[PDB]
Amino acid sequence: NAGVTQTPKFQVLKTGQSMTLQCAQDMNHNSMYWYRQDPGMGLRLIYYSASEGTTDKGEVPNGYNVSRLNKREFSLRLESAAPSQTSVYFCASSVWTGEGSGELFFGEGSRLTVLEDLKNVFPPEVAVFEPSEAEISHTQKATLVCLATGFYPDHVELSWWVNGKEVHSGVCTDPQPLKEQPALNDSRYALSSRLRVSATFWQNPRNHFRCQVQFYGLSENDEWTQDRAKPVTQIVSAEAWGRAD
Amino acid sequence: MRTHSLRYFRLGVSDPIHGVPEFISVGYVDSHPITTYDSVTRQKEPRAPWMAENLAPDHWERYTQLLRGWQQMFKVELKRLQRHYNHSGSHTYQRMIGCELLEDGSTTGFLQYAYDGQDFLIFNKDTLSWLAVDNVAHTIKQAWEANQHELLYQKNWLEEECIAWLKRFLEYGKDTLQRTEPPLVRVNRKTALFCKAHGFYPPEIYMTWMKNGEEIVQEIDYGDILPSGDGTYQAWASIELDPQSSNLYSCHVEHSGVHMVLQVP
Amino acid sequence: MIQRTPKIQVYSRHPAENGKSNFLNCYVSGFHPSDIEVDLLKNGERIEKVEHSDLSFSKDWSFYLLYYTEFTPTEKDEYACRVNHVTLSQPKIVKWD
Amino acid sequence: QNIDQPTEMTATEGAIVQINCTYQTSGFNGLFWYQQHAGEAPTFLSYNVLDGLEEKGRFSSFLSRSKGYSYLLLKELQMKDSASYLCAVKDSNYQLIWGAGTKLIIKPDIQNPDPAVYQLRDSKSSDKSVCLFTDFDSQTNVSQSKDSDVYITDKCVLDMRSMDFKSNSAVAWSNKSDFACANAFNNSIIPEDTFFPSPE
Ligand code: NA
């Protein structure tokens, strides 16, 4: 009952590099689709497969190929990636096709960024800033802030951990990153998140707060020639402890 | 315009012999085939020259993909039917969808299915329901009627899309579909009087016999309207002569708004 | 299971006349299921070059086909259409009149 | 063939909003609405193909074939309705044509506005000073910085489930020596009663 499962969630590519995106469905559907979603426009069909054993071009097939390997699987192939193919890719399936009312079921999406040079790939700096004493006395609440700054591309997942357990209530993470230099096309990004707790929760000295950012970057086979450290996929985190004073 | 219709058939065979296709789908405008597809070619192809000349390759490529999906669904549906009938051997599954644009501007629309050449399920697009002929059909009726959106989609397609396709194809083939070739009609003796017509288009024609001014329906033999192979049709009607009493026999032919009377001396 | 036997009709395209080029038609209709064998006969022998329409579909779920051949009718030559179907225990020969 | 819907709409929590979709297509086999939360997959909301209004919970979808027009109606808006809403139409060839989507922004109802700008504690591992503008009413807009070395994020609605409490906040930071929370949000129009606790 997984529905539509596509991988990977994030991928950096150099111009010219090959990529295959995987998609499987466990709903016994017959029709499968590959879309790309880009700002300012509706979903565009790249390729589709009306039934097992047949496939055909969509609206934007150039630079891509597909394989309906079996009834469950529909892979998408970028043989020689181009920057124009920077997009979020969605796999979808439907019970049949050529039936007016049947809806689409979508996978989670795959964010591809294709770059001329990997030398502008950067992991985030992560820092946690402890609540304002003025806020505590004025509101009886305490807001921690996490800043993840200087990363590129925008392939990050930020999470808050309290006492070894991930939390979501009281958390607000910016839905979109901030361009640190809004005028530059390759600008590195910033992202802020807040965790707000009761003053009494913050004032417990055994409470431990941690902000962690998973960054998806380079891998072993990506070539690196810069003086700085290779920006591999990694977790960067920062912490704070509750203060009784 | 005269009345015109557009319709598509599908045929599935569960265990066909050596060369026969598992699946065939053909469209018609009036009596003229316009499109074809089967499980061997796996391609949608024109069957009329005015369809080839007016529909870009993008049309045939798209519907070719849809028909490959429709082919697989027909196989799954037929397998389910034959399983529920508990039938062995080879059996047929059929579908017909279409619409009519009548002379007065009114429209009709229809969708039905058959198993082994007999009615199975018949769509009522006014009550939005399926008529089941037996309990295998009843099981399918319940599953189909639970998907109310698809019923509404089928009503819209029959009433709006089908009619729009038909008007489009009618303009494409208007030199064929909207022409008139009046019949050549004669009477001869073979004892019965045979009233014979040939060379006419469209195939719709009404031939009957009168005796002293009265029509004699039970006494008349009506021949089929048959194709002659050149785009025109032929037909006939017979009536038995009374050897004991003379009568005033006359053949009456109605075709495309023209009435014709051949009085036999 | 209702199987429907073919109706077979043999006729000429235009009214026939000896020495005038013509087309001999065999229209086989109303049968079910769809598999069928149709031959045109001249003096009892099967004509070689014989054309046919594609399998066609009727509203009542039966099928029909038109087999035809070009010919010149001569008073000595007899013509027939030979049809076999699952509903026929052996071919049915319908002679041209 | 075009599908048009507004780029963005903003409404208040608890109210009603109507998202329009107009289409011009070669034929019509139905209109779909999909909900897509930010960073997530679209999910199916509604299908219309005949004329009229269909209801599904708080959402209803209307269709007029003759006007080539549909709307998605959301009643009693909640924060969880913040999402993009995609309309899509099947044409005569059963091609799905997608509109560009409407981003729906929901303003929380702030029962007890307490606007303030607080200085967060420095971190020994960072050179940044960090300021938090928080607890203001939803009519307030947070402007981007006019200083290239000051970074200001847009407002974020957080929900403290335990206390059924919602609050707006925006964050500003910089490593400049002259950066001060008292002037961090100077380029925004902030409430007159905004509380500025005294520095140390
Ligand atoms: Na391609």
H, E, C per residue of B36-57: EEECCCCCCEECCHHHHCCCCH
Minimum distance, in Å, between the CA of residue A17 and any CA atom of chain D: 25
Chains contacting C with at least 3 CB pairs below 8 Å?
B
A-to-D residue pairs, Cβ atoms closer than 8 angstroms = 149
Minimum distance, in Å, between the CA of residue B73 and any CA atom of chain A: 8
* Amino acid occupying residue D135: D
Q: Do chains C and A touch (3 or more CB pairs under 8 A)?
A: no
Q: Which two tokens stand for residue C42?
A: 């001249």
Cα separation of D84 and B100, whole Å?
Answer: 42
In the CATH scheme, what is the code of domain C1-97?
2.60.40.10
- CA A119 vs CA A111, A182, A187, A226, D70: distances in Å: 19, 19, 13, 7, 48
In the CATH scheme, what is the code of domain B1-179?
3.30.500.10
A-to-B residue pairs, Cβ atoms closer than 8 angstroms = 42
φ/ψ of A45, rounded to 5, equals -80, 130
Cα separation of B235 and B216, whole Å?
Answer: 18
Q: Which two tokens stand for residue D44?
A: 């199916």
Cα separation of B223 and B39, whole Å?
Answer: 36
Chain D residues with CB inside 8 Å of A32's CB? none
Q: E strands of A104-207, at which residues?
A: 105-106, 110-115, 125-129, 141-151, 156-162, 165-167, 171-173, 178-179, 189-198
- Cβ distance C32 to B117 less than 8 Å, yes or no, reads yes
Q: Which of A101, A224, C24 minimizes the C-alpha distance to B154?
A: A101
- Cβ distance C59 to B96 less than 8 Å, yes or no, reads yes
φ/ψ of B235, rounded to 5, equals -160, 170
B212 torsion bin: left (phi>0), alpha (psi -120 to 50), beta (else): left
Cα separation of C37 and C49, whole Å?
Answer: 15
Cα separation of C22 and C19, whole Å?
Answer: 9
CATH superfamily, domain A1-116, is Immunoglobulins (2.60.40.10)
B10 is in an annotated binding site: yes
Q: Judge contact between A49 and A32, C-beta under 8 A.
A: yes
Cα separation of A58 and B86, whole Å?
Answer: 42
Determine the angle formed by the axes of helices B135-145 and B148-156, rounding to 10 degrees.
90
- Cβ distance B150 to A53 less than 8 Å, yes or no, reads no
- Cβ distance B226 to C11 less than 8 Å, yes or no, reads yes
**What are the boundaries of each domain within chain D?**
1-108, 109-200
First-residue to last-residue Cα distance in chain B? 37
- Residue length of chain B: 265
Where, residue-wise, is CATH 2.60.40.10 in chain A? 1-116
Q: From the CA of A60, how far away is ligand 1's center (Å)?
A: 8
Cα separation of B101 and B105, whole Å?
Answer: 6
DSSP code at position A103: P
- Cβ distance B13 to C4 less than 8 Å, yes or no, reads no
Q: From the CA of A65, how far away is ligand 1's center (Å)?
A: 5
Q: Which two tokens stand for residue C62?
A: 């039966």
Q: Which two tokens stand for residue A56?
A: 């055909």
- Give the technique used to solve this structure: X-ray
Q: Judge contact between A54 and A121, C-beta under 8 A.
A: no
Cα separation of A93 and A103, whole Å?
Answer: 9
Chain A segment 132-151 residues within 8 A of D by beta carbon are 132, 134-135, 138-139, 141, 143-145, 147, 149
Q: E strands of D8-101, at which residues?
A: 8-12, 17-24, 31-36, 42-48, 52-56, 59-64, 69-74, 83-90, 96-98
Where, residue-wise, is CATH 2.60.40.10 in chain B? 180-264
Q: Which CATH class is domain B180-264?
A: mainly beta
- Cβ distance B198 to C62 less than 8 Å, yes or no, reads no
Cα separation of B79 and B76, whole Å?
Answer: 5
B155 is in an annotated binding site: no
- Cβ distance C57 to B11 less than 8 Å, yes or no, reads yes
Chain B residues with CB inside 8 Å of C62's CB? 117
Q: Is D86 on the interface with A (CB under 8 A)?
A: yes
Query: Per-residue b/e over D132-163, b at no fewer than 16 CB within 10 Å?
Result: bbbbbbbebebeebeeeebbbbebbbbbbeee
Q: Which residues fall within 8 angstroms of residue B106, CB to CB, at 6 or more apart?
A: none
Q: Judge contact between B138 and B145, C-beta under 8 A.
A: no
Chain B segment 127-166 residues within 8 A of D by beta carbon are 149, 152-153, 155-157, 160-161, 164-165
- Cβ distance B161 to D49 less than 8 Å, yes or no, reads no
- Is beta strand B92-101 parallel, antiparallel or unpaired with respect to B4-13? antiparallel
**What are the boundaries of each domain within chain C?**
1-97
Q: From the CA of A19, how far away is ligand 1's center (Å)?
A: 14
- CA B50 vs CA A165, B14, B230: distances in Å: 70, 34, 17
